[PDB]
Amino acid sequence: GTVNWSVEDIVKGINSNNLESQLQATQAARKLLSREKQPPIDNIIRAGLIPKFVSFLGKTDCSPIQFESAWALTNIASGTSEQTKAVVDGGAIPAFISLLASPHAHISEQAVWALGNIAGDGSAFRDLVIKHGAIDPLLALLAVPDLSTLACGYLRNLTWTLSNLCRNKNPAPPLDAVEQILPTLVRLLHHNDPEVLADSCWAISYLTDGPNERIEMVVKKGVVPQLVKLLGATELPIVTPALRAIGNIVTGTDEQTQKVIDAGALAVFPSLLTNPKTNIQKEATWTMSNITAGRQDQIQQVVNHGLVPFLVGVLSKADFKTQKEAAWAITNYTSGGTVEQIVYLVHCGIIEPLMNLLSAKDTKIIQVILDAISNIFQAAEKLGETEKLSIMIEECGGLDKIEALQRHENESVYKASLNLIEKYF
């Protein structure tokens, strides 16, 4: 009946003076817009359909056209910014927020989905959705004693939409919207659905990707243990954002970092640091680097958890981007650690993999490494072990790489490189 219509038939039905004909054509439009396989979103836009779909959002009397049009508009809003912008420009936001109160769960879910596509576009539409008042009615949909009584696809959708209200950064969402949403987010984080968890962690990750005050808002909700637990999850879609969130938290203050340590995060890193997914390994190493940038007692926890050998292993063999985070983790460790922690690091075998990485055609990793070497030499000075270390660096072929790095055409490379050769070799 409504499969494979032309856009001009859809226009003809929508322009009829007949609510059923409009309904049928809207459903035809929706079935068209559901075939991706490149849905004809621009064709529908160019036909001038959007304002009509938006008006059908308000046909309370005709729940099915509300739904078809919601779905059509959802799918348009899923497109490019310009496509989402067409939907918004039609007045869809307030109309979708009204549909959130719909007694039809499939329609309010559709309105949720649409608003998630709109908010998903970026800061401006996110904040516009927020200004139109989406958050109360969104949150009210979750104001049930037990999230388990909600339909799964429904909950997943809310979670997803709410995560897009948490997302994007220039600017970050309004502080008061973040505060309004956080309690429901904390609750979704304890929900036993892997997708709701993935998206809750993503929302939390977006909220912690910011200045310390933003990190703090989240850390204060007491989420860090739950994040740490999610970090141990077997589902990579949960581990990925739990780790992003944890990682973001440790770029915060040493006190925020300590919350992650106290939550037991470091016990998961043997796994994460050897994780077969290179993204997790990279991000775990990055996370590591912002913990080794912390206090000596925090470096100590890294040591105590057995993590230095795992840093050495990542430094020895990892995807290059992970090796570069490991290099960072080591510089930070060496710049901030006690002499005994730094000696420890050397006893674990840091030197040969650090030296092997001086062979990398990447100028920032060389500077990070040379800088770690200097830090290590500085610790060796405090002990009169500069000779024992110089030999070590020389035996693994590290002197040859530092010597060859004076012929390097970079301001800090040849400067720190010549400084080391002249000072120790």
Partner: peptide
């Protein structure tokens, strides 16, 4: 970051 910003609905 991350998972998709926008989602096309293909099924009911």
């Amino acid at each position: 970051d991350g998972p998709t910003a926008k989602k096309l609905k293909t099924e009911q």
